[PDB]
Amino acid sequence: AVSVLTMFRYAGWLDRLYMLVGTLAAIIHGVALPLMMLIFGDMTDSFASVGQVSKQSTQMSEADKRAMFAKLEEEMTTYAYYYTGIGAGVLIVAYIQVSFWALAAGRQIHKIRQKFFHAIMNQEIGWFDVHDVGELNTRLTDDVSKINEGIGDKIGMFFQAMATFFGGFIIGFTRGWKLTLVILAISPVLGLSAGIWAKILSSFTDKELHAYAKAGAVAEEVLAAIRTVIAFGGQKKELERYNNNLEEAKRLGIKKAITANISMGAAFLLIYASYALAFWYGTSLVISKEYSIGQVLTVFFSVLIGAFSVGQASPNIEAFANARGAAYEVFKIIDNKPSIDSFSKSGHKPDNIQGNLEFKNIHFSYPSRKEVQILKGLNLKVKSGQTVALVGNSGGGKSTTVQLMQRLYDPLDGMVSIDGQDIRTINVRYLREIIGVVSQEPVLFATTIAENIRYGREDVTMDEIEKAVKEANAYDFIMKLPHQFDTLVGERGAQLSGGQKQRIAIARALVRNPKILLLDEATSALDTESEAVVQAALDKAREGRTTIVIAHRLSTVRNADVIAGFDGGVIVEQGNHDELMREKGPPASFWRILKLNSTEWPYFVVGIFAAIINGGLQPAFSVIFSKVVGVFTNGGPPETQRQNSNLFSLLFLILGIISFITFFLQGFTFGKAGEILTKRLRYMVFKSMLRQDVSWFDDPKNTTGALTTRLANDAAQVKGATGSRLAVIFQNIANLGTGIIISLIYGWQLTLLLLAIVPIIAIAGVVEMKMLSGQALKDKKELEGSGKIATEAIENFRTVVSLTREQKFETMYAQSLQIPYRNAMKKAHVFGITFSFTQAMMYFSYAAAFRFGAYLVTQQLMTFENVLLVFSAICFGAMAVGQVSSFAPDYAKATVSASHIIRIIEKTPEIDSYSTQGLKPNMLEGNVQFSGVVFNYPTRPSIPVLQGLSLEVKKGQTLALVGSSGGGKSTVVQLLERFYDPMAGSVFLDGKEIKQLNVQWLRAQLGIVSQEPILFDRSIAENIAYGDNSRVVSYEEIVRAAKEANIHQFIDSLPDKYNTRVGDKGTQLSGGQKQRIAIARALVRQPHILLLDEATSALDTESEKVVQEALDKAREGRTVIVIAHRLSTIQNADLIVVIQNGKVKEHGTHQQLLAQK
Ligand SMILES: C[C@@H]1NC(=O)c2csc(n2)[C@H](CSSc2ccc([N+](=O)[O-])cc2[N+](=O)[O-])NC(=O)c2csc(n2)[C@H](C)NC(=O)c2csc1n2
Ligand SMILES: *SC[C@@H]1NC(=O)c2csc(n2)[C@H](C)NC(=O)c2csc(n2)[C@H](C)NC(=O)c2csc1n2
């Protein structure tokens, strides 16, 4: 499913040169580093030779050396010159590499996009028929960008990294004959261990994901049917299950965090030591008088630098593979030679053709459904001047006879000839432009009428095409509203109705001036007044040329002289027409109060001191490194050299292991805090959802899947927001502060240069990142110019190919992408110049800083070891700054978004319910009055309902309030439970207003049942007990309620009734019997009033007969209000008081015919 060594065949010779020079520049840039390392090695060796000052006789005679210092400064001048030379060279070569590679990539993307659009716009219609619309355009938008990114930047950096790797190792094979073995023999063990660590991390992550999916799904379930959940008032009983399931996740997350942090600590341990090992073997070799300090430094620094570089190339290869796959698909679309081309200059030129259409053995089936043969052979001959009307169920399925006229499909063994010439020999474009097509629905574009008319044929004059449009129904639908010209009719700007779209489409068809016309569903389901005029246009078009008309409406059939239509594929001649039956008819977060949510200071205070002590490691490493170098440079080689070297190596590991245990403690506290905050925030958010009520849940802005993602992939954001954003900044600031102060202790002047060179590099990196991010943000805006035409073109391809206007869309796409082409070229140049800029300033600052340090050493004040200490400390601190930032969990990625969204939803107040300020009368008479109650949908206030409803309810009432649709009557029964609120109306119950009737105790007495008995995955016995849950929970009444519900006879299968739960649709109950289970739950509620809305969703049949049996037993037992849009249900209701929107009272059907049907 991939392709390689083919993605660049569409590049020109200049592009090949571009790529070659880019590769050469990348190779040079890669080779740059090892040479610099070797220079540094020999340069430090020269220091060690000169700066030894071992003999006091030289130190006293002739003003110390004062001449060896001259040789030293000459050597330093030469070294600094060669530094700046290689820095300028790296500048130039890196600029060349990045710029040429990215510009060649841009040219390739331009060519690929143009060819892709041209090919996809040229395929046969069946290709789109076996495919969809939006997915293709999404592919077009995404894969081109993926290919660009890859075969630009990633392949650009890959050769650079690989050349760096071979370079350092070659320096290794020159100066590190044994250093290489220890360094490369320690390499596999360290990398492998971190990998065993990555594998364990992945396993723990998968376990955590599986564990959270159990509970998250309990969650998705309680939400899906949240209306029932709030109706039965089981929030207090339900949050407990949510919490236990959540708990079987936070301990797993604690384990996962422990694993990740101990893995990081182990990686540090494997690096500090072994790095330690290298010094251990190198220093001993220097003691053996065969190697020097520079010899060790060059190989050690070089081999490692290269290994990093070679390891850095993995994401580049991943992007390359993605680009390979995407290129494979997009090329697969390309070169897909269709059966019809419509572009090749081939075929005979028919002229003065009458248009005698023919049909002989016409067999065809749609490629989407080849199983059903749409047409099974027809024999027919027609003559020009006699329009033919087809009558039947449809146009042979869907306008099939029309489809083969313009070669939109390919006939199978059937031959059609307009004038005795087969369509295959006739040129496709010429055949298209001589036949006019009328669409069933006239899709147009948001553009002015002028180009809509010009889409017909090659425009000769604006006035001429206007005169062509001067046919009837003009000057009113084209001049009154559209201001006589230049009005972008469509969804964007002065949207019109189809009555004018059909007329302008017919006007375009007349601009075609066809030999033959085709009419398809002129006014299919249009307004009955919009017709009777468009048909006049069709008739006057008929007077010009012969047409084939297919429509469901029979009005045109009388007008048509020849009526040759049938159904089922059996041809019926046009001898007579009377035989056929005549149918009658989001701000940011505080970052100070968010963390204040974590009131776990005993779990939190450990980290800050731990973070500082962790950041304190790196400058200590720099000090130890400087001391190791000074042991051989400013050393004591007469007396003792082994003692201090071995002591420094021991310091190397004790420091490594203390950093390891520091990371252990830091993880053990920070991951635990993050996981406990995860569970805390989630448990709150769940109860916040519960107190939000139906109002917010009915808001379409929030959906069930979106809210499940809200509970899923936003707590991890706060996890990083807690520790990472604080631990990282504390570590970085501690490192920088302690490095700065130790540099000040060991440096009074050079630190000024260090603090002057660091900020320019920092701001250069920041401006580079900001510029690339801004260009990426703009890329969407300029690429949307392509989409503004591509979306409409792909959507309306049927009409587009039905029209002759093909190349114009390609030209507009070419221009609207050519502007982004220049934009991308300039962006490429900016990216290249800024990358070369930052690299060049890095090298040049290295050179200048080291040269001025050398000058100050020649001043005999700060000796080399101090210079190396300060330089390495500052630069490694800055390098660690960004590196530590990367190890964080996407704080840079959107995170504060989910953070403050969670804050907002948690701070959300309860609009209604879940409060103690409720008055609960002990017993209720049930005297409800739904009189003068008016209220609408808060979520959709555009549609007002529930106007002027007057009702009276008493004990024994059987109000069968039934009305048309559901928008006017469902809310009536939906208001008894106060899911919504009455603001214009007033509701009285027991002489008391409902707004303070102890909402929980209110829902307690309501036996409401939803229309669809949606049920969650609780055990059947526990599911039945869920009725009166959060109330007294008791045994030996569930069986009593089940028996009273007359359900025991069927459910006695597996009579245990306790563990026979529905295991994710396992042991599925009958579709109509779930509502029976709902009835049983309502009965075990022991209400005083019951509300029913089940109606008959499925084919309940005999099961339905049993459910109104249950209903009538329930209503003769206790007062029940039945709501159902079924005539049989109300006829079953003996107490016939049907009221619909309050026009009538009591039994309407007896008083008037209205309620009956
Ligand atoms: C604990 C802290 N480390 C990190 O925060 C860290 C995380 S990722 C990484 N570093 C990279 C990938 S690792 S390179 C490497 C090099 C050599 C060996 N070995 O087994 O001899 C192992 C490894 N390794 O850990 O994969 N390191 C380099 O790019 C690299 C190449 S030269 C070099 N550093 C210089 C000489 N040393 C340090 O800067 C240094 C000393 S303390 C320290 N860093
Ligand atoms: S004193 C200026 C500079 N400091 C940086 O922090 C810096 C800017 S860009 C950068 N570091 C990249 C991320 N560096 C490396 O990838 C890297 C790993 S090892 C290494 N560089 C060599 C040994 N050191 C430098 O190149 C260096 C010296 S000064 C400096 N960077």
Author numbering: 32 to 616, 689 to 1260
Provide the authors' own sentences about this structure as they appear in the paper.
L335C in transmembrane helix 6 (TM6) and V978C in TM12 are situated at symmetric positions on opposing TMD halves, while L971C is located two helical turns above V978. Based on the appearance of the yellow DNPT byproduct, Pgp335 and Pgp978 reacted with AAC-DNPT within minutes, while Pgp971 and Pgp302 did not. Importantly, Pgp335 and Pgp978 retain notably higher ATPase activity after crosslinking than the respective apo-Pgp mutants in the absence of substrate, suggesting that tethered AAC still acts as a substrate and that Pgp335 and Pgp978 cycle between IF and OF conformations. In IF conformations, TM1 is a long, straight helix. The non-crosslinked molecule is bound in a position that resembles the one previously reported in a crystal structure. It interacts closely with the covalently linked substrate, which is situated further up the membrane. Both ligand molecules are oriented along the vertical axis of the protein and positioned side-by-side through hydrophobic interactions. The uncleaved DNPT group of the non-crosslinked substrate is evident in the cryoEM density map.
P-glycoprotein (Pgp, also known as MDR-1 and ABCB1) is a prominent member of the human ATP-binding cassette (ABC) efflux transporters that removes a large variety of chemically unrelated hydrophobic compounds from cells. For Pgp and ABC transporters in general, ATP binding, hydrolysis, and subsequent release of the cleaved products (inorganic phosphate and ADP) fuel large-scale conformational changes that ultimately result in translocation of substrates across the membrane bilayer. To address this fundamental question and overcome the dynamic and transient nature of substrate translocation, we tethered a substrate molecule covalently to specific residues along the putative translocation pathway of Pgp and utilized cryoEM to capture Pgp structures with bound substrate during various stages of transport. In conjunction with molecular dynamics simulations, our structures trace the substrate passage across the membrane and identify conformational changes in transmembrane helix 1 (TM1) as regulators of substrate transport.
